[PDB]
RNA sequence: CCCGAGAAGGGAGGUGCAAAGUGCCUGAAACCUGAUAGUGAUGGAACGAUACGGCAUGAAAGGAUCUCUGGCAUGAAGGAAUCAUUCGCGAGGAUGUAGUACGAAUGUCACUGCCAGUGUCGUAUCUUACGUUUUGAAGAACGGGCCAGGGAGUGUAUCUU
RNA sequence: AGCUUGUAGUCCGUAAGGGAGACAACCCAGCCCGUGGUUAAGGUCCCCAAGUGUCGACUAAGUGUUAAUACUAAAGGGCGU
RNA sequence: UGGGGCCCCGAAAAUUGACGGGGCUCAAGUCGACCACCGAUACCACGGAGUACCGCAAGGUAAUCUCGUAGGAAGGCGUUGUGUUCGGGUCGAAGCAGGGCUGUGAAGUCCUGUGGACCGUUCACAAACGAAAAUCCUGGUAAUAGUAGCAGCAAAGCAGG
RNA sequence: CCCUAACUGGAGUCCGGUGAAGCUUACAUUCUAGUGCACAGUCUAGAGACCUCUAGGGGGAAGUGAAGACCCCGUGGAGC
């Protein structure tokens, strides 16, 4: 769950900000691959088979 | 030094503008009040009072009143006066009502193709008449 | 100093390439002069409405293979020699000085560069980057 | 050591291969301060491209039959001027001169010390940004103040080729 | 109706460059790069490269100086010419 | 009296404005014809690039090849690492600012300065591999701007030391 | 209100100190008409316009604030 153990949710429209999920008690964006500290989109998987 | 007496306004303007754009001379035009505008007097006066009273004359077009300045404006309309070339051309042109004292006795020229006796009718007025009916003192 | 081996056909193509490359445009990315965030390198225009993609002549030339230099003199140094990048002393033996000039690698130290210069000057090989 | 109210700070002077001078390795851009080059208080705007000029620079990495300026030879397409004759109401046409002189360029010989490039400004022509939604975008349609960094077709299983 | 819905061709969409003041689709033209020449459309009084071009007439109204286009006013009348 | 050309009346709109503008009257308008010229990247000529097909190769052919959105196909550039070949670096690696050259280009290389210890290269193989956009995210920082505010509270301080 | 005038204190105005924020792709001294997705400072043709600064009310920038709460659509929801 790297970059994903947050409960961040979007603010929605009507605030002048992107619709990305934010921390419940701050404006810092979370959990999305283009957010700082967010998860890697399409990372290497330990379950991948390279044999 | 071109004598504008009995000359078509637009044709004299075209000749002088093309000479100025050929750009080796200073042109002086005298007796600008004596230039001719073909067409009926009523129509010419109507169009010229329309142009004089047209614009947003507080902050719009400013059509001149003197006949020499009107002729200068007419030549200006046939020049790239917003360009450096047209600015030099208009700077090298001087127009006079009658003959200025310094040019008095100087040798003048006339454009044969601008002569008013090539007109086919008598439907014409003079630029001086137009100016004085628009209210210019000269 | 040994004269270039450039036959008259190669001389004519070299001068043709000189003239044509004097006219080739710089091929900067479109609108690179308007934003400092953009580099000068070339990117193919992509937008449907882009004037440079539509090839408006006023917007500057697009990158096309028609601008390629003549194939006989392609890659030659403007002096007429063939540029050969020498990364060590052992590469000087594979170069013949008749039409080839060596460019010593920029990171070569002074101690080895002096030896490389001595070997090149004994072999007669022209050098593009020496200390003069 | 000097200045400074100073246990601030600055100057001078040292240490160290190098100030690297304590949130101190390297030290970009945005932004801000100053200097230098160009321009500039009569001037018109997608901030540029192309050609030609003024000014500055042009040490290295670019050129030395290279740059400049001419001569000579050959020269594709094209191709005069002038004059003679003739036709046409006329503007002009036809024939000859003449496929001649010239002509992209290709060679060659002299002459020259600059040229390429770079910055800015000027003259000429062109161009109403970019991405997107759109039949239609310069739009008074949506997005970005700016800059740096991050930011999007990946793995397992299975089928097909 | 610059409306809506068909059909044939061609275009824009995805089409440069040249010309129409500008013009998605109107005219020439489909366009690798450089140089020279001659043309197309259109233009030749100036702005603007080239005609103040020739011949024969008309128009006196600044009418007009507007290929196509939805960007150009009708019926009727005139012993105007 | 009939049939025709051009013009006139019919003909009134809102900011000052539209033959593109100036202007133009045996025209610079209209009609019927004509002459010369200007004017594209069209066409011709030369040179060059790429492409298609053919050819063992050398090379040959292209008037019948060269615009392009969605989209398909081919070949390349770059980042980081692995195996492997061959190297560079304190006589100054990477990075950074600016510049020269090459290449259609992705980019590569070199020069000057700065920097102080690491960096490339052959043939292959991989990917957490390329950003200008997402009212994108994080950080830094402008214009706004020395501007608004520092005014109802509530008579708010003055003299001398 | 006809129909406004004078005056009082606080702001404002000018000076010292302190010191933010919000609109912003760029450029930008504009005005008229046309054109253009038929509501242009930037296109086209004209007309104007020497630059800088201060004060002032808000014509315009279809000004800013905000993924229209009206209408429709979505085999999207919620309650009743």
């Amino acid at each position: 769950y790297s970059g994903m153990e947050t409960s961040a949710r979007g603010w929605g429209s009507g605030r002048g900000v992107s619709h990305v999920p934010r921390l419940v008690n701050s404006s810092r964006a979370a959990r999305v691959p283009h957010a700082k500290g967010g998860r890697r989109a399409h990372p290497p998987k330990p379950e991948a088979d390279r044999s | 030094v071109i004598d504008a007496k009995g000359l078509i306004l637009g044709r004299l303007a075209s000749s002088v503008a093309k000479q100025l754009l050929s750009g080796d001379e200073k042109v002086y035009i005298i007796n600008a009040e004596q230039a001719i505008i073909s067409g009926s007097r009523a129509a010419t006066l109507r169009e010229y009072r329309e142009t004089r009273e047209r614009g947003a004359t507080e902050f719009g077009p400013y059509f001149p009143k003197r006949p020499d300045r009107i002729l200068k404006r007419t030549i200006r309309g046939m020049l790239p006066y917003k360009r450096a070339r047209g600015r030099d051309a208009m700077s090298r042109l001087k127009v006079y009502v009658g003959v200025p004292y310094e040019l008095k006795g100087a040798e003048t020229v006339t454009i044969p193709d601008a002569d008013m006796r090539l007109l086919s009718s008598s439907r014409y007025v003079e630029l001086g008449e137009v100016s004085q009916k628009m209210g210019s003192k000269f | 100093v040994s004269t270039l081996d450039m036959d008259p056909e190669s001389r004519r193509l070299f001068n043709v390439r000189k003239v044509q490359k004097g006219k080739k445009p710089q091929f900067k990315r479109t609108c690179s002069h308007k934003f400092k965030r953009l580099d000068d390198n070339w990117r193919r225009p992509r937008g449907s409405q882009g004037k440079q993609r539509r090839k408006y002549v006023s917007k500057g030339a697009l990158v096309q293979v028609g601008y390629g230099s003549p194939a006989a003199v392609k890659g030659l140094h403007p002096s007429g020699y063939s540029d050969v990048l020498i990364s060590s002393i052992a590469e000087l033996e594979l170069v013949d000085p008749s039409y080839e000039a060596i460019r010593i690698a920029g990171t070569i130290g002074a101690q080895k560069k002096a030896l490389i210069l001595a070997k090149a000057e004994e072999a007669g090989i022209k050098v593009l980057n020496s200390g003069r």
Side-chain angles (χ1 to χ4, degrees), chain C residues 5 7 28 31 37 40 43-44 54 60 62 70 84 99 112 124-125 127 129 131:
Chain C
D5 290 331
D7 59 359
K28 293 179 183 179
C31 284
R37 77 173 81 106
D40 274 12
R43 293 291 183 269
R44 163 186 91 80
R54 293 182 183 178
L62 278 296
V84 172
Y99 70 96
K112 279 187 147 99
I125 298 150
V127 172
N129 57 338

Side-chain angles (χ1 to χ4, degrees), chain C residues 56-68:
Chain C
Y56 283 27
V57 61
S58 64
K59 293 283 141 189
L62 278 296
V63 167
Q64 319 156 57
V65 293
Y67 290 97

Side-chain angles (χ1 to χ4, degrees), chain C residues 30-31 36 40 47 63 82-83 93 96:
Chain C
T30 192
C31 284
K36 293 179 286 291
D40 274 12
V63 167
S82 178
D83 293 332
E93 56 89 15
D96 58 332

Side-chain angles (χ1 to χ4, degrees), chain B residues 10-11 38 54-56 74 77-78 120:
Chain B
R11 295 182 185 271
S38 81
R54 156 174 306 133
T74 295
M78 300 178 190
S120 79

